[PDB]
Amino acid sequence: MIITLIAAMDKNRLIGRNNELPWHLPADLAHFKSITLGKPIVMGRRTFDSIGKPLPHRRNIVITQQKNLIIEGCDIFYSLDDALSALTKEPEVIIIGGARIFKEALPKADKMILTIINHSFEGDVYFPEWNDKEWKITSQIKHFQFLELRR
Ligand SMILES: NC(=O)C1=CN([C@@H]2O[C@H](COP(=O)(O)OP(=O)(O)OC[C@H]3O[C@@H](n4cnc5c(N)ncnc54)[C@H](OP(=O)(O)O)[C@@H]3O)[C@@H](O)[C@H]2O)C=CC1
Ligand SMILES: CN(Cc1cnc2nc(N)nc(N)c2n1)c1ccc(C(=O)N[C@@H](CCC(=O)O)C(=O)O)cc1
């Protein structure tokens, strides 16, 4: 199983604000869709609420500590470790966020797919700092930009 983090972030690593995104970038969302189509996507409960519904044509997996919580359309796990353990036989697992999930996933991450937006927005949640010496750029396309890093 390859563990991949996919995130859209600005130059300060901002990813969220008041549990929404600080932008709307249609080019990013269609990038996110093709990349995640047909694969297990792992998200936190707050990120699920932000989206508002299961993303179609994907196995939506939500991590919560709420034991009575049921979300229609999605699989619930009570830790990232229970999720990853249940997806052992999968060839790729895609972690979509948010800030808390990214931070816990990062040290297990094999690959990162990052949209870095050239701007500075106001917000309150961030993508965790990664040691640039531990990763290598496998692809860079400057449109914002798409950056693929492999560990
Ligand atoms: N720019 C981007 O690419 C992305 C941005 N975002 C943005 O990020 C923000 C949401 O991120 P954030 O607020 O950090 O919240 P998260 O999306 O990380 O979800 C947090 C919740 O996930 C559950 N959780 C997290 N870790 C664990 C664990 N180890 N075990 C059990 N449960 C766990 C808890 O749920 P519970 O409270 O139910 O117990 C926790 O409250 C929003 O603004 C969203 O729009 C989100 C994804 C991608
Ligand atoms: C809040 N949230 C989390 C979110 C947003 N942008 C991201 N962008 C990137 N690059 N990576 C992420 N993990 C990411 N996550 C969202 C919000 C909406 C949709 C969404 O409606 N996407 C649909 C449709 C997108 C479209 O309109 O084409 C899809 O099928 O992927 C996805 C994630």
Rounded distance between C-alpha atoms, residue 82 and residue 138, angstroms = 30
* 36 CA closest ligand 2 atom index: 31
Using omega within 30 degrees of 0 as the cis cutoff, is the peptide bond preceding 73 cis? no
Q: Backbone dihedral region of 102: left (phi > 0), alpha (psi from -120 to 50 degrees) or beta?
A: alpha
Q: Which domains does the chain have, with CATH numbers?
A: 1-151 (3.40.430.10)
The sign of the dihedral angle between the CA atoms of 16, 123, 121, 139 is: negative
Strand partners, 114: 7, 147
Considering every ligand atom shown, identify the ligand nearest to the alpha carbon of residue 51 and give its number: 2
Spacing, Cα 31 to ligand 2 middle (Å): 9
Return the residue whose CA atom lies nearest to atom 11 of ligand 2.
7
Indicate the top mutation candidate among 32, 51, 93, 95 to test ligand 2's pocket, ranked by most ligand atoms within 8 A of CB. Answer: 32
Is residue 115 within 8 A of residue 146, CB to CB? The reply is yes
Spacing, Cα 78 to ligand 2 middle (Å): 23
Rounded distance between C-alpha atoms, residue 84 and residue 90, angstroms = 9
CA-nearest of 31, 17, 34 to 120 is 17
Spacing, Cα 31 to ligand 1 middle (Å): 21
* Tokens linked to 13: 């690593």
The CA-atom distances, in angstroms, between 92 and each of 45, 68, 81, 103, 145 are 21, 29, 15, 19, 23
